[PDB]
Amino acid sequence: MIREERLLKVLRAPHVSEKASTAMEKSNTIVLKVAKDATKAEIKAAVQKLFEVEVEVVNTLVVKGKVKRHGQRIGRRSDWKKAYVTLKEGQNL
């Protein structure tokens, strides 16, 4: 099993957008920003054990950071990971 100390550090934020919103209200999937080194077994286990719901399957993409600039000083943001967590028929959050 995955230890609970690992399993708390994985989920990072709920992702709020309109693709996320239509995924919830149309296909049971909650979209959430996860740890960059988090595997699909860790995300599945962490939503099973931290929101106490039943997860059908996880799909993970990794989002690349945008090169912004302040003034005349550039900088890339930071890569993050986004997990499309497809729940079962019985869920709320």
Partner: peptide, 19 residues
């Protein structure tokens, strides 16, 4: 109290902070 600092405090404040 380790697992309760992580569990109750830390995670719920990251989820509560970013929402």
């Amino acid at each position: 109290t380790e697992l309760l600092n992580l569990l109750r405090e830390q995670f719920n404040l990251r989820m509560q902070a970013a929402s």
